User: Which sequence fits this backbone?
DNA sequence: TGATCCGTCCACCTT
DNA sequence: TAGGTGGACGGATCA
């Protein structure tokens, strides 16, 4: 995500009841779930409970898994750290969780690259009605209709949309991509000293990062209060704004991520009680009757 | 002062009405008033003789409530302070790589004497000398905002005296001890975690972590032994609890080194044995000299005598 | 000037 | 994993 971005977008949130999501097709960004569940087979327990919450409220989810890591992201990570192996164990957990999904009759895909980018594309193609994720990157990838904190234990979830963000904060997609280069994200380290308050002020005052850069480099005398304090801060943090600021690579990474444009509509099956019974028995030692108590209310006649 | 110390002592503060201080003898720590008035009072640059205006207004407030002040000025800067501060600056520089005149001092002291108010110059730090005055019962309280006064053994402190309020914040060592479990040695050892004029403290140690260290280990020697013994004999780590395993991880990440200067006897000695005047001769308060105050304010600030009279006559 | 305010930074926690 | 949070940090302001 973009660092501190939810602090900025937070006031535009609209609480909606879980009951209002009935029959909605929802892209579920599941790229990060296995890591969050890292008692044997906690990934299964974790996926099971979240899947049940979605289906309990009649949501029609499509699960999206990460594909590759793009180069800019790999680089930015690398500069921040500056019988089976881990990969094999990961492969197995993903496979098991996907087996669980299919027994629930829930479709899933593996994005070519970032899951959130793919989620945004699913919504653009009207293959889903909304996106369930807590990763603010989704906005920069052109996402809207985002449902955040879906898995907190509250009666409501937070609904965000690109329209409200524009109307209320004056921010469009290019603005958010530029905010990322101040705040930092997976694709850029941002600027030292630039938090959500200073970053928003910069966009509001200078409109864009080019003007921001120009005001800075040219000036290095009749500057107002705001400009004077900001310049000293940039100086004090040894900020250099060269020909790579703003970054065309960052812009392209968010504006043109690798996604699948396939327009085949997703198909939802019904949960397979028999196969879920045996799966849960095998994986976690649940008696069938225990599985039934949770799962039978999910079975239409 | 000791960094964040008022955050720690704050909840023991008791609000006291200025009216209650009538006839109290009060050591006034005036060591940074001049520089403060220089920086706090400007035009559109320092306004002229703001040190006179500033001192005059504060003196009148004290006299208005019948306080019997004795003003204390700094003498020298202790070597340990000069060393601490210069090292602090050197290391901050090594991360990125309006003056007080003798006449200003003489002027405010002339003002003081025309008010008939006794003043002294401490051999070194004013706060240390204030604590000594109280210990010898030459005064009944100390007016200062600088937390160092507790470490120098000051026990009855009046903070925010010149804020625009009906009350002043009273602090005493006995309440700090009783309510926070902190004695003088504890406070001096807190300084070595938090930082003060006499030590740059430890990275990562704010008021929360520093209080925890003193509570859990009792003293810095015990803390050091715990850290160092466990860093060497890793076997001693296996049995330590959550707090200790988390604290250790933090100190390591912060590259903390606790050597033979930790705790520092130089720091302890500087607070326990500051250079102060031990004279037991009581102070004598005079009466304000209206004639000489009139001419002083006239000369220094252009105040017509009638302006001075309007303020000074009720005080006399 | 020392203390306070407030925006930011950092690492742990929860998931 | 990574958003949130608790605690620390630091520059600008208070007074
Ligand atoms: Ca992302
Ligand atoms: Ca001091
Ligand atoms: K930043
Ligand atoms: K510290």
Assistant:
């Amino acid at each position: 995500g973009v660092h501190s971005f939810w602090d900025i977008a937070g006031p535009t949130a609209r609480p909606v009841r879980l009951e209002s999501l009935e029959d909605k097709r929802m892209a579920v960004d599941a790229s990060i779930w296995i890591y969050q569940f890292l008692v044997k087979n906690s990934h299964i327990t974790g996926f099971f409970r979240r899947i049940c919450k979605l289906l309990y409220f009649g949501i029609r989810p499509v699960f999206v898994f990460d594909g590759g890591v793009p180069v800019l992201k790999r680089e930015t990570i690398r500069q921040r750290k500056e019988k089976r192996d881990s990969d094999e164990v990961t492969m197995d957990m993903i496979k098991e969780v996907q087996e669980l999904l299919s027994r629930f009759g829930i479709p899933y895909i593996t994005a070519p690259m970032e899951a959130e980018a793919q989620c945004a594309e699913l919504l653009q193609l009207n293959l889903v009605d909304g996106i369930i994720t807590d990763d603010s990157d989704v906005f920069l990838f052109g996402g809207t209709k985002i449902y955040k904190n879906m898995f907190h234990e509250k009666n409501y979830v937070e609904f965000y949309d690109a329209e409200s963000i524009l109307k209320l904060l004056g921010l469009d997609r290019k603005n958010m991509i530029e905010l990322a280069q101040l705040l930092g994200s997976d694709y850029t380290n941002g600027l030292k000293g630039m938090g959500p308050v200073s970053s928003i002020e910069v966009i509001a005052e200078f409109g864009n990062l080019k003007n921001f850069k120009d005001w800075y480099n040219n000036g290095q005398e009749t500057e107002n209060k705001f400009e004077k304090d900001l310049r000293k801060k940039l100086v004090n943090n040894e900020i250099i704004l060269d020909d790579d600021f703003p970054s065309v690579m960052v812009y392209d990474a968010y504006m043109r991520p690798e996604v699948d444009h396939d327009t085949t509509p997703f198909v939802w099956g019904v949960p397979d009680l028999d196969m879920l019974r045996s799966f849960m028995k095998t994986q976690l030692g649940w008696p069938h009757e225990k599985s039934d108590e949770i799962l039978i209310p999910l079975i239409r006649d």
About this structure: Residues A 1, 114, 116, 135, 137, 186 surround calcium ion (ligand 1) (CB under 6 Å). The radius of gyration of chain B is 23 Å. The longest helix of chain B spans residues 79-96.
